[PDB]
RNA sequence: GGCCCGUCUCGCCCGCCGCGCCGGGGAGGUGGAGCACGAGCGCACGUGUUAGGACCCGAAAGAUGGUGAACUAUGCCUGGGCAGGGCGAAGCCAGAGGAAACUCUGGUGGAGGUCCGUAGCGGUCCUGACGUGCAAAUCGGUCGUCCGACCUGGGUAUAGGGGCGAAAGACUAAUCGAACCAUCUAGUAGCUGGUUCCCUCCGAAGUUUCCCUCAGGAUAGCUGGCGCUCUCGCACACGCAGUUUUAUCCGGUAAAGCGAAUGAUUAGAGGUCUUGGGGCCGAAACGAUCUCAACCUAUUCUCAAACUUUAAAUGGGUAAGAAGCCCGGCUCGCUGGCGUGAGCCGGGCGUGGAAUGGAGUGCCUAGUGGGCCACUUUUGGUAAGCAGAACUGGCGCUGCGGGAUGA
RNA sequence: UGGAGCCGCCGCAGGUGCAGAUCUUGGUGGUAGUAGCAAAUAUUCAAACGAGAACUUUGAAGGCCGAAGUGGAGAAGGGUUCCAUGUGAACAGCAGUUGAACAUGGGUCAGUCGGUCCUGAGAGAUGGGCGAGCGCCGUUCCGAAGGGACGGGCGAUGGCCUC
RNA sequence: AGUGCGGUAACGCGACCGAUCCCGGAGAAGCCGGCGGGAGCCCCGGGGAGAGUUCUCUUUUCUUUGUGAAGGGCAGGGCGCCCUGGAAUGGGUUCGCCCCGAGAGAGGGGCCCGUGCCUUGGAAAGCGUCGCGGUUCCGGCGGCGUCCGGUGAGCUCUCGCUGGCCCUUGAAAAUCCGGGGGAGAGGGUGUAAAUCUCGCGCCGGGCCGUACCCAUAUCCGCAGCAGGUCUCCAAGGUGAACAGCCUCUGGCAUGUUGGAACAAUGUAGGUAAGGGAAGUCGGCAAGCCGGAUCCGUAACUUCGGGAUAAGGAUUGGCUCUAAGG
RNA sequence: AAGCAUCGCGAAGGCCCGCGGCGGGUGUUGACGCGAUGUGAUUUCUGCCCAGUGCUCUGAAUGUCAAAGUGAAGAAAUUCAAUGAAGCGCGGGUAAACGGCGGGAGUAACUAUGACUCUCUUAAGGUAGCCAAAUGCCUCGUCAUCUAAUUAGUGACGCGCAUGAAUGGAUGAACGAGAUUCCCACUGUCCCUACCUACUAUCCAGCGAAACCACAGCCAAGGGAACGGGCUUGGCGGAAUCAGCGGGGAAAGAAGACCCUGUUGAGCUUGACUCUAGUCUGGCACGGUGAAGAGACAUGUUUUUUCACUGACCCGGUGAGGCGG
RNA sequence: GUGCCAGGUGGGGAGUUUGACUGGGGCGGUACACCUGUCAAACGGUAACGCAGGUGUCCUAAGGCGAGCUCAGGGAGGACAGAAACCUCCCGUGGAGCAGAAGGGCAAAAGCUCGCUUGAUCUUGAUUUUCAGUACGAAUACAGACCGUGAAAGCGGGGCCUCACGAUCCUUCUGACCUUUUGGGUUUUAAGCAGGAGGUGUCAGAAAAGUUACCACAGGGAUAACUGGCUUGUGGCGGCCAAGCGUUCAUAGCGACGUCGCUUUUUGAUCCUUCGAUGUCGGCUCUUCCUAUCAUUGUGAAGCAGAAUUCACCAAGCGUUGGAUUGUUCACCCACUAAUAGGGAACGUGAGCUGGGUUUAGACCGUCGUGAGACAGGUUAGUUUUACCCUACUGAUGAUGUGUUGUUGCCAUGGUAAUCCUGCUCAGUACGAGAGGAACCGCAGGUUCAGACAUUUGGUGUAUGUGCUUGGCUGAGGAGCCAAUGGG
């Protein structure tokens, strides 16, 4: 048969991301002497909307402590961050909203977001539109910390890394329905070509493993194993349960 | 008969540089493509069987390497475009009714994947026109939509078992259930079509057996050619038959029979064989009357491809002599009271019933392996110009006279 | 008729005889002077040129496209098709004195109009990696990736070595 | 002493030192609605020049009736620009909004666009008329005019203000400019260093394409093919309309031919007494209604609609009245 | 398509591309995200079943279990025995996974049926709803109604060959170039046809092909290879043509597509036969250093469990900008 | 994590297969390897998806000897005991049994019961059976040994005879003081020779699941779906006899139990033509033909009194309707009518029409299948090509002879055409108990058809004849024009 969709998505070139009008990479400020020992101050110039993202970004300008130059950064502004606000960053930073500081120095129970997974990767976790990670417990020896991710998972992350304080601005975005194929088209047009999703039962049996037959039925069990090959692994990928 | 090699059986004898798990020999079975005082080699010609393009033309295919996103499918970048009207969302103003609570009314306002509708986009219906057209998909009326999932130019990206698809296996340059170009490739085909001068002579088969065999091959059969071995209407013939006769056997078919067996089956008559049921005279009785289920005795009617005592006609084998008789004698390890039986020698006797034939034998070897019809017999079927058999003859392969025409 | 080679016999050899193959090439008939030259209302009179006028030209009349045009200019594409003169052999499915046909010529002038410059979607080199290999992957990734300039110091020629 | 001066200020004047460095802006931003300013075109009342009718009328019908880029001045828009002053009895104000003690009305100013008018260009040229020079060749010669105004939700273009929508936020770089600093330079009392050049003066700007068609005949469809192909401009009338119809500017000969008759069957339009779908698989085709104004509008419903539901009346011309600046 | 509901994934990850690599898309991404599904707005509801096929969880409590390694015999090739990973078996979960939802017996004061109870193959046996449906062979089921007449339409009944609950059931406003039935007006659809117009067709001036063609062409019967233009017997036949016409030429158009055969293919599916990419697991090498601990042989050898270090190797950031005492 | 092995998963992907016979193919069966009786026509041989059947086993004895008896059944008897329990006598040609299906064969056996046994052992050939005179399987006499049994003759190397079974290659076991193991010697191992086994049931022997309506190719009328051809079981129709129905009375009208025929208007049966194509159903239109006559004309018979209605003859001349439903062929219903008879012409008729439902490709539902998919199950939307050729026909010029022309005509031949009904009088009469209820000739007219014609009426209408008007244009009036014929 043909190569199925999803299997065709790996090559790209029609399925790549629409990264034309996006305003850059939303990354934390990298670690240095000021991040490690003290704190350096920056100003929030403006807040911008990034295409394909439900969260607004914030242009934050710092002064470079080694060369005379105003360094700008792309943070994700917490809900409540206004322009003209002094965002501090480092180890000695005070605990308030929009003030990135390490998890080993913050008290536990702190609602944080834009969390680093490994120390130094400029912010990876819990930073979509309204999500937040919580700090459960610390550990003085070996510098480890327990962090609850917004999926309910509970992860051992080292205490050396940092996160901005608060929730991601733009919460409640999924509470409103789309109401239109047009609004869903405009939503995914800024992201990537993935929205018109033909069900594989309605397809011919040569471009999908569920197509064919005089009636639109699946025919085989839709729950497939993890050890399934490419072009076959279609349906419910290694389902533990499947019902309501 | 004899000999060589392999294998099997029964037994003994001979020789040594090394006396042995040595080597050789006898007789009798049996297998070999052997010997038995050679016949091959080399070249050329004809035919047949093959491998090769293989008599010629022909596929649906498969693989390898490249070319296309000028059409179309989708994503991105940059530009362009979309009259005039209808309904009147939020917000806002004013008035009226009442107590706030509030409720109506008149405006303003211009939202909608809203409505009519132009340009644009597309193509429902007339299944209209045309249908060797204007056109390898157009035209007219009627149409759907026309501010958002809209239309469109240029640039660009995705390339063939790949792409792309609001998903029709649709599109991918008039080519898509796997594009196009070139090569392997003159791919293969038990399958269709065709196969080129004359005359003479001979001349078929659709059948046996086997094959994943049923449109085909192989093998026998039918056929042609090349020959050989012999005989002679030159005073002087051994053998052979789709033939008959003379003797000798075989049958179990037609017919006939079942007063004979097996199976079916009709009706009277005479006998308590022997019980029993509906029964009638009787408490009952083989005491009188008959009945049928199975009883007997002689009779009587109709049968049988898978019954038969009998039993034809047509048929099938044999013998009609010299390869036959009559004698005398050797051999035997078979059998053996002497004897048998078989094999070798030597000698003596020729028209072996009718008519007709000149016979025997060895190589190659094409085509065929779809048949059909008719007298008689016969299976299945209501029957068939139906299907399937037996002998024989025809058509096929064959004209000619007749049946008006015509296998 | 033709104008330059050819045949009989003995032998050898072959790309050696056509009526077919929806055979291959070329040519020609019936059909047949037939189908047809019928989508978007329409032409008419007089004169000039000529051998020749329904189609050329001029004048007049009547019409059509009706400013989302049958108008005036560009892009892609075509490449001389643009213009003048002459011809009417072939083409303009009738004709033509006409044409985008033929034959001679001629015509496109830029600091300001565009390309040229930049970058977008993207393409594509060096390093690096992969691959038997033509090469392929990738555009910051396993890079010593700058060839520039101010102020000062040394040295040197050129121009009236002062500058 | 002297790298300028003026204003309360927004800022202005013809220049008005300045580096490596840093910061910022322009480049550089969606779609739609509404309003306002300006232009081009259209309309009306006239005045001039030339053409048409004038069998009757018509101070009449048609054409024309202007000024480039580049500087200066002034109208006209916009201001989220500044000063005085502090407002409820709330005010100003738009089509709608909206604004105001974080400073509204009322005064006084300032900046930007000024494509509009005048002005240099510039009336010499262009146009419309009348009359001539020259046999011809001849880019001519002269007499006049190119004027005064107003309206409009008019069509198109441009600029500005404001609002709506987005689970859409609507591009980069080349290049140019401004600011913060003060490394550094200047001459020492008539000169200089400087002039992100204030005015003038001098030289140069190389290479490539430039014609025509652009579409019922110059392109692609085998062709002068009823097909396909991206755009700019858009007159008058009727009319809601850039719908349809007629006309002006411009264009053409009816689309690979004409003549004579009007047979059948065709193709495309129509019309039919009486019946109204009885025809046919099937109201297929055809036919009825249709614009606007005034009434009126059911069931159901997601309370938005249905809905132009269904169903009635009117529509011409002429002469007036009243209202709308 | 929005709405609804699932599944996987916390980055040495999920899905996927790639001959290849510290390769690449999602990713300028981070559970309100990405990838794979089913159903298809609103309301309401989504019953029972894990026996089967799938998917998934742990388990030295373990049947099967390859290679490498361990021990025993021999002169060795070789053989034997124990150990024996993942996966299959065993045990839970899972139906908005694929799917399935039948029979038998007893039982109610008329009969009938079964509210109730037990069992089967195999796990429950069709729940709420709905229907002669687009779904019902019988069938044109039965009744009511629409008609003069209805195999059509609508409303009810359920005995439903063979309806049924996200393989979604039911209802439902608006919408539909979707499919059916009736009614009002309307009309040549028809009774039943008629006439007019334009372009053709007709003739003419000029120009002018193409399909097709064994020979060509009047019929009745007979026979034939079983429907003759030709043969036989009859009927008979007479030059050259024009406009129509559709009866014939089993007219043309294309080596029937239907059905069959071929030891001919191709697209697809899987519980067909062989394989294979990917993926999971085990062994050897890259692969080092220390700590305690358990087991086996035996009076040093092997299987090893976890932790600690970086020095190989991997990941992240930077303009490798302050790392350890 | 990489490199290399090992194990699981694997239609994500690749290659390939999906037997044969067959009154077309699938389904159903094996007629695919064998055996008996018949077919089978008196040697043998002989076919069909001809008939009845049977087989892929079973037997340590059911094999091999020797001995003794007779079996099944019947009659007669005997306590329980009867029809069948056990004992005895007689008859008893096999009418029982021999493992099975059938046939043949058999009486001191080939059966039953005993006693002993393993000839059911090893090794060469020859022959028969299907046959090509090749195998395999089975069998037939023998030959050499070793044996069993019996007193011996002899019998026996499997089953009383006809079936009970299997190549190459590979593997396994057994046997020889067997050969080789490639320089020589030993040993393990391996290869050889022969015999047996592990099996090819499609049985002379590939290793093998489906679907295609998205399909393709080479062919076939060797082979179907249509029509045509033979037959007529079936469908329809007509006779022969005559027990009865009919108040008596077989035959006015019918007619059982039986039997003889016609038709291709129905379905069957066959495969003879066509698969280098003969357009596959209905309906619309239109023409001709048959009679097996519904009505009309002329008649005969009735259980014909009249009316009405049945049977039968000559007879196809003229008629056989409008609709609701269904695609319908059929069917049923409403109404009219004299009557609403049955059929054929390639199941008349697609270069005549339509495309309604079969019968492409898109879809939805139900059943089946894991699936792709299938369903004379239901629904929906689905391009209907060409005549200008020859003939036939409809019309039109014409043509040959009459010396040429014109007028007037005749005529062979060919076509043919009229049909049916209502009202009045007869007549409320004939007839009849009554109810009811005719017929002939006349009179007035209608239905269908045919041939004409436009006085009237209706339609058409571009005399573009004449008014009325919408928009635009010629300066206005007048006169007009365009708007594919502006409209009325
Ligand atoms: Mg589909
Ligand atoms: Mg698949
Ligand atoms: Mg199913
Ligand atoms: Mg060849
Ligand atoms: Mg050859
Ligand atoms: Mg070939
Ligand atoms: Mg292949
Ligand atoms: Mg269509
Ligand atoms: Mg059509
Ligand atoms: Mg035509
Ligand atoms: Mg399909
Ligand atoms: Mg001869
Ligand atoms: Mg064959
Ligand atoms: Mg016999
Ligand atoms: Mg007999
Ligand atoms: Mg043959
Ligand atoms: Mg036959
Ligand atoms: Mg030669
Ligand atoms: Mg020739
Ligand atoms: Mg003509
Ligand atoms: Mg034309
Ligand atoms: Mg032009
Ligand atoms: Mg020219
Ligand atoms: Mg010409
Ligand atoms: Mg103010
Ligand atoms: Mg130009
Ligand atoms: Mg133009
Ligand atoms: Mg017009
Ligand atoms: Mg015309
Ligand atoms: Mg003309
Ligand atoms: Mg033209
Ligand atoms: Mg009428
Ligand atoms: Mg009807
Ligand atoms: Mg209609
Ligand atoms: Mg309504
Ligand atoms: Mg689901
Ligand atoms: Mg459920
Ligand atoms: Mg389960
Ligand atoms: Mg229920
Ligand atoms: Mg109806
Ligand atoms: Mg109903
Ligand atoms: Mg169900
Ligand atoms: Mg269902
Ligand atoms: Mg013929
Ligand atoms: Mg015809
Ligand atoms: Mg064929
Ligand atoms: Mg074909
Ligand atoms: Mg075969
Ligand atoms: Mg092959
Ligand atoms: Mg293929
Ligand atoms: Mg398998
Ligand atoms: Mg496969
Ligand atoms: Mg294949
Ligand atoms: Mg077959
Ligand atoms: Mg015989
Ligand atoms: Mg005995
Ligand atoms: Mg012996
Ligand atoms: Mg015996
Ligand atoms: Mg299908
Ligand atoms: Mg089918
Ligand atoms: Mg045949
Ligand atoms: Mg037939
Ligand atoms: Mg009959
Ligand atoms: Mg009687
Ligand atoms: Mg044909
Ligand atoms: Mg035909
Ligand atoms: Mg008669
Ligand atoms: Mg009808
Ligand atoms: Mg027919
Ligand atoms: Mg026809
Ligand atoms: Mg047709
Ligand atoms: Mg149809
Ligand atoms: Mg279909
Ligand atoms: Mg003609
Ligand atoms: Mg006559
Ligand atoms: Mg007038």
Swiss-Prot record:
Q: What is this protein called?
A: Large ribosomal subunit protein uL2
Instruction: Quote the subcellular location field of this record.
Output: Cytoplasm
Q: Which UniProt keywords apply?
A: Cytoplasm, Hydroxylation, Isopeptide bond, Ribonucleoprotein, Ribosomal protein, RNA-binding, rRNA-binding, Ubl conjugation
Question: What InterPro entries would the database entry show?
Answer: NA-bd_OB-fold, Rib_uL2_dom2, Ribosomal_uL2, Ribosomal_uL2_arc_euk, Ribosomal_uL2_C, Ribosomal_uL2_CS, Ribosomal_uL2_dom3, Ribosomal_uL2_RNA-bd_dom
In the UniProt record, the gene name given for this protein reads RPL8
* Cellular component terms (Gene Ontology): cytosolic large ribosomal subunit
Q: What does this protein do?
A: Component of the large ribosomal subunit. The ribosome is a large ribonucleoprotein complex responsible for the synthesis of proteins in the cell.
Q: How is it modified after translation?
A: Hydroxylated on His-215 by RIOX1. The modification is impaired by hypoxia.
